[PDB]
Amino acid sequence: LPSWMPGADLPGYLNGTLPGDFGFDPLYLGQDPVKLKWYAQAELMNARFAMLAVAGILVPELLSNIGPGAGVAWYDAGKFEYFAPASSLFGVQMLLFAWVEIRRYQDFVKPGSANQDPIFTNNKLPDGNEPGYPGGIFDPFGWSKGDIKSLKLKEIKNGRLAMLAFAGFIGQAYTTGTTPLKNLSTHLADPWSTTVWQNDLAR
Amino acid sequence: MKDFTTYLSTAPVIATIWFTFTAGLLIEINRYFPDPLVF
Amino acid sequence: RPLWLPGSTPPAHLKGDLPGDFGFDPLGLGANAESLKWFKESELVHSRWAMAAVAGILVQEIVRPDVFWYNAGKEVESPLGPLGLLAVEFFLMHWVEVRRWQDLRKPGSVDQDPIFSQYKLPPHEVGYPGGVFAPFIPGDLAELKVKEIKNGRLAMLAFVGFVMAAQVTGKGPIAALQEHLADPWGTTIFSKAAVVPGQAVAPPCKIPASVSYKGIEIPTPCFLQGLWP
Amino acid sequence: RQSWLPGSQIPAHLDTPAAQALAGNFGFDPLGLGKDPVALRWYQQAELIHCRTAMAGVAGILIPGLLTKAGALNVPEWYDAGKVAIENSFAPWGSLLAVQLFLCGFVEAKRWQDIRKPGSQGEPGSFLGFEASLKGTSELGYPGGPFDPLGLSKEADKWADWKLKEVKNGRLAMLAFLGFVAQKYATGAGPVDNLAAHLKDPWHVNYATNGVSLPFL
Amino acid sequence: VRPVWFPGNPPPAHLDGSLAGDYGFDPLFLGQEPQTLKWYVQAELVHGRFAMLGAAGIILTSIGAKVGLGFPEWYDAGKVVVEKNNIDFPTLMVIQFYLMGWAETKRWYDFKNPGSQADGSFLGFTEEFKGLENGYPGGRFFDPMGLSRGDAAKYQEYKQKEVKNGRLAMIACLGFAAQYAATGKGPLDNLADHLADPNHVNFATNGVSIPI
16 A cells, blocks of 8 residues: 555545545545545546646747747736637537537436447447546547556656646746746755745845 | 531621622722723 | 661652662652653653763764764764755654653553554563563563663763763863873862862863854853852 | 533533523523423524625625625625615615615514414415415425525535524624624724724734723723 | 651641652641542642742843833732733633633633543644643643653652642742731842841731731
């Protein structure tokens, strides 16, 4: 049993059936099984979204600092043309994000109900539903050759990591007013005088 | 001692002490807050 | 059995099993075995700390004299950020201490190198890691432990007496020793102070006042000033 | 169990299947006002009413007043907003008053008749189609149909949870309203500003320093 | 057979020698009743410990005063420190009120219900708010050193010493109050004075205490 605290006392319900379970619930907030399901799903969603978010942060920053459509700071929200008004596209979005939302939820509440293209009934997902892990068309590259577990564990691991990453992004951005890559380059130039206490006490 | 407690739980002495308490209440009231007319 | 008092009787919980005992606990606080192991650990801890401390202060006063070890806290210099140094310090210490404490509260539970699975310490005694923690052993722990505890208690006394000697003379312990040697008669707190119903006297401290470091200006009072004699 | 005061004794009528099965019980009845079953039932309904109303009110105070600290949504102080609105309005305040009195009165009378008889307004044909869903949901203070549209009353797991959170947050909203009006009398300032000041210096921004709450000092 | 507070007379009924400091002294039979007596036991314990606090702080501060450390005289010290600092008297008082109220209420309802305070209804602790005896809340918190849980005999002896030093501390703080009420000075000052002339430094010299 890999634990977040060696030799400690794991809760009973935590039993490793979910990837990244190190027996961590000092607040016992997962005693309800339905709650545990809800929160497994929520961890997955928020974590994966944090992954893709921090990627969309880092990559274009890295490309701007090198030799290209834009080099704008990631939080520079209202400022770009993008040849279309934001509100319209946002409505488009909310509708379509609601579409995953609804069939995501439908298959969560009633498994094995959403596999086919409702238009192209032939075009259909297999039985490997695994609420949260459809695969099939979601696994076109012949992956899931591995069991599932190595990828699932690294998944939950990196997801938690990326959640922390985004938290640091927004927090240090609100504090320093600066860009994360720049902040890291500063810490690299000198770590010995670039600390929280350094800058909160200069603050 | 218990005899004494009973003697204090006798009636007229209780009436006494309650009245003394109330009266001292109201006298101090008028002392610190003289001349009340309204409110 | 050799006793801390010749011709006396040991208390209940004291017999001589653990080294360093000779029947001394006039307050009899060694009753509860839990707290007793706790205190064995804590005494070993303090003894080892103080032994290291006296050794370092001595050797440093030796090789680099004129550097008041007591005021090294002030007069140290390094291009490294003091804040970063103390940070590394805190984190390193939190780790090692939580390891030793987790092992105390749960014996034989962290004995592995959690990185290199091959490396894992054999079973041992709380307060006696050994193995890697004690790779080379000449002789027997029978005597090693008794000498350890003896030297450690003695070094605790050494350290505290050094602190007093500094507060009273500001001199390094070797300087104070040479002074005592110079005047065997007049180099005594006796020859320095006394108290009488007529009047009392105490030696003045050499630790001046609030030390002004790089902006902080640490307030530096004395240890129980008024009751030095 | 979770008691309003450990060590202390539990009120008998509060230590009952119904009461301990009502919601959020802690044995809190020093003066013993709910010994009668009808009485305590009435009070349960009452607490429900007050909880929900206070939640609504404190929301309508904070959220607009909170975002008026934000750039957009320039809204006045809550207590003056009455004057502001009657200014920006068209119908006389007494008029709109009487209208909303009619409106609230009808449905309040509905709630009344239903508390009198749970199967009262289910009287078939009384309305065109109301009765069907206009029946209670076996818990006075918990109607159905339009009440709980999304169907959150069906899942028994989260049921007592919704209930406990409801009663909690409702009592707290009451307290919030009270603190707001109290610091409006004492400090005279908006509650958000009171909070900002107590943030700037709790050590000197408090009723202890108002000389209002405690004038003898 | 135990030494009576008054040699020659027999002790009262409800006084036997079961608790430390029992010398048969209740000439007014206030402890005729068991509940009231036990309550008084706890009250005496509490007050004696408070007096111990009082004496210790007083003597420390008075030494710091007499020797040139600039420590104020205790009866002035509260005012002088609240003045030297930017503290608000009512705020101090009300926080102190909060704290003493909560803890003393815990103690009160434990006297009421002997053990309901260790039930674990508190955050996560159990038996760490469980009284060993009346007025003796010996637990991991009120006895982490575990003196009570070893050598009950020496423990009883310690109880004896506790109540002893407690009555001593009560009479001592009363004495200090009197010394200031008389001389207007520091008790240590008046002490050094009686040292100077026991023959001529005393209440009889004050002429105030004895008004002749």
